[PDB]
Curated annotation (Swiss-Prot), chain B:
Glutathione is required for the prostaglandin D synthase activity. One of its GO terms (cellular component) is cytoplasm. Glutathione binds at residues 8, 14, 39, 49-51, 63-64. This is Hematopoietic prostaglandin D synthase. Belongs to the GST superfamily. Sigma family. Keywords: Cytoplasm, Fatty acid biosynthesis, Fatty acid metabolism, Isomerase, Lipid biosynthesis, Lipid metabolism, Prostaglandin biosynthesis, Prostaglandin metabolism, Transferase. Its cofactor is glutathione. InterPro entries: Glutathione-S-Trfase_C-like, Glutathione-S-Trfase_C_sf, Glutathione_S-Trfase, Glutathione_S-Trfase_N, GST_C, GST_superfamily, Thioredoxin-like_sf. It comes from Rattus norvegicus (Rat). Residues 81-199 form the GST C-terminal domain. GO terms for biological process: glutathione metabolic process; negative regulation of male germ cell proliferation; prostaglandin biosynthetic process; prostaglandin metabolic process; response to nematode; response to selenium ion. The lineage of its organism: Eukaryota, Metazoa, Chordata, Craniata, Vertebrata. Changing residue 8 to F: Moderate reduction of protein expression levels. Abolishes both prostaglandin D synthase and glutathione-conjugating activities. It comes from the Eukaryota. Bifunctional enzyme which catalyzes both the conversion of PGH2 to PGD2, a prostaglandin involved in smooth muscle contraction/relaxation and a potent inhibitor of platelet aggregation, and the conjugation of glutathione with a wide range of aryl halides and organic isothiocyanates. Also exhibits low glutathione-peroxidase activity towards cumene hydroperoxide.
Length: 198, 199
């Protein structure tokens, strides 16, 4: 099965797919485009957004729809429907938070006040809730890794670029990052991947 | 006895996808609707402090689309194949992305208005054109059977029509899809009895 991933040269919304491909040892083409390439490409995609994943000539879209697809019938999804629900919900909670950042905002001044608010006022509420949900479990769902844990590593990696001191009082969430990053396939991907800010 | 209690505001909003699925699958639930002024008493009781949630034997499930997808598992509503389930999820996410751009809770009523009007007059046409192109001449988004993506279009389009009643004038196939969803007997009976709210 030929897999062609297309995104910008960053971790961003494609990175969850990249982790899953790494974890499952599935070969794929990691196609990256420059900002100035994008207007020519945007009209050629069904919903004019990236990432997209081409699978056997079919173009799939929506980072989380694709990630979920790739984890189907694996433990990464959650082993039961109830667990799948919790896994999906943690991912969506994280994605909701990351989606508040005004990434394309041109007013640099406004972007900065909003970012600072997200990182200093709002993030502690989210982090507290993630910490309370993880509790003393090894992984978000309990005793096995899911793509929610991947997504926490991914989101926290960007959050830490933006605010390096953010996880001061959440040792459990730092342990979870560390557990994800020590998974041999993930560790090899992290070492290997292009070094981008986002 | 195990039962389902849905907690949300007295709105369609993000709970309505769950309500359609429950109606369609004939799943019994308590449709608990929170007045805005009571919300701050309830927020502390929910693990992630947001609604909707579904309270079930022990657990509190959260995230509208996580819950919706859970209720469709092993059901044709999900999509019949893994691939189709991906397409279903993706359409739902595209609609959710767009409804999520609206600054629903914005205090600055002048800003709120400019953003709503920009979304409805500038951005919406691109999304509608893409959804219409995706649907093409198919009976339903996925092909020949209804999925929760079609339900989610009915729901999103209902609120979008409240905000801009002429939004769908040039997209007859998207109107047709709303009509087909609304004509499903369990959906039609739910629409008939649901509380009349703006959102
Ligand atoms: N929820 C979607 C969001 C897709 C999205 O908006 N992607 C951005 C890049 S992070 C994009 O396509 N930007 C270009 C544009 O909007 O034209 C997903 O996760 O795939
Ligand atoms: N993506 C989440 C969003 C949940 C959300 O933010 N819900 C709003 C109401 S539409 C809420 O809980 N607002 C009250 C608050 O944040 O205190 C979902 O679909 O459940
Ligand atoms: N630029 C950018 C960007 C946009 N959305 C994201 C969502 C989740 C994680 C990282 C993200 C980065
Ligand atoms: N207030 C509000 C509100 C109403 N309807 C929604 C539909 C989809 C997503 C978010 C929504 C928020």
């Amino acid at each position: 099965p030929n897999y062609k991933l297309l995104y910008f040269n960053m971790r961003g919304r494609a990175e969850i797919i990249r982790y899953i491909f790494a974890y499952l040892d599935i070969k794929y083409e990691d196609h990256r485009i420059e900002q100035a390439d994008w207007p020519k490409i945007k009209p050629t995609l069904p919903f004019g957004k990236i990432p997209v994943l081409e699978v056997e000539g079919l173009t799939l879209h929506q980072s989380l729809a694709i990630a979920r697809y790739l984890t189907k019938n694996t433990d990464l999804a959650g082993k039961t429907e109830l667990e799948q629900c919790q896994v999906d919900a943690v991912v969506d909670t994280l994605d909701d938070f990351m989606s508040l950042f005004p990434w394309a905002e041109e007013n640099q001044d406004l972007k900065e006040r909003t970012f600072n608010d997200l990182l200093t006022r709002q993030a502690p509420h989210l982090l507290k809730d993630l910490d309370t949900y993880l509790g003393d479990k090894e992984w978000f769902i309990g005793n096995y890794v899911t793509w929610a844990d991947f997504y926490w590593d991914i989101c926290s990696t960007t959050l830490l670029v933006l605010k390096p001191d953010l996880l001061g009082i959440y040792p459990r969430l730092v342990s979870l990052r560390n557990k994800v990053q020590a998974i041999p396939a993930i560790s090899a991907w992290i070492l290997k991947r292009p070094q981008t800010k986002l």
